[PDB]
Amino acid sequence: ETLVRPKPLLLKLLKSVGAQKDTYTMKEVLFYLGQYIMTKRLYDEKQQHIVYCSNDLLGDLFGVPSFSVKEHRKIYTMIYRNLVVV
Ligand SMILES: *CC(=O)Nc1ccc(NC(=O)C*)cc1
Ligand SMILES: [Cl-]
């Protein structure tokens, strides 16, 4: 029950999947992020652990063109840089 407040771009991403609160648990942020990736089918249909996020809000957010869902350290860093732990 780490509570977080997302930065503007991450809030836009969360609201695009129906999450309109301003404060979240980290678990909620990760959940919505995964729902965003799935709905927009940003993962590679043949290599489904690879997310291509160039030219998308998620890439603008993360500042990378792609990442593997298995890269937890990198993903947590990119998420942390886009919110404030309160
Ligand atoms: C179904 C599936 O792929 N589950 C899964 C569980 C855990 C992890 N990684 C870690 O817990 C670090 C990957 C995939
Ligand atoms: Cl932002």
Side-chain angles (χ1 to χ4, degrees), residues 7-10 82:
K7 281 192 167 72
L9 251 31
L10 179 59
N82 276 280

Side-chain angles (χ1 to χ4, degrees), residues 4-6 11 14-15 18-25 28 32:
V4 303
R5 294 173 184 283
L11 206 48
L14 294 165
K15 64 70 190 163
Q20 310 137 15
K21 307 200 286 192
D22 266 359
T23 305
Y24 297 82
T25 63
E28 285 173 307
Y32 288 118

Side-chain angles (χ1 to χ4, degrees), residues 10 17 27 32 34 38 40 63 69 82-84 86:
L10 179 59
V17 290
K27 186 149 152 171
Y32 288 118
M38 279 190 279
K40 294 202 87 174
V69 304
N82 276 280
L83 54 59
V84 56
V86 294

Side-chain angles (χ1 to χ4, degrees), residues 3-61:
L3 293 168
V4 303
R5 294 173 184 283
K7 281 192 167 72
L9 251 31
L10 179 59
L11 206 48
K12 185 180 205 262
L13 183 153
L14 294 165
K15 64 70 190 163
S16 77
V17 290
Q20 310 137 15
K21 307 200 286 192
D22 266 359
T23 305
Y24 297 82
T25 63
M26 190 69 77
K27 186 149 152 171
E28 285 173 307
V29 168
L30 299 183
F31 177 93
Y32 288 118
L33 180 57
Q35 290 199 153
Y36 179 89
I37 291 168
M38 279 190 279
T39 316
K40 294 202 87 174
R41 298 289 200 271
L42 298 185
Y43 61 86
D44 191 86
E45 44 171 25
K46 260 158 109 183
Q47 256 199 317
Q48 302 207 358
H49 61 283
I50 297 289
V51 181
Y52 292 111
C53 52
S54 296
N55 311 127
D56 181 82
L57 184 55
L58 185 57
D60 300 340
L61 231 128

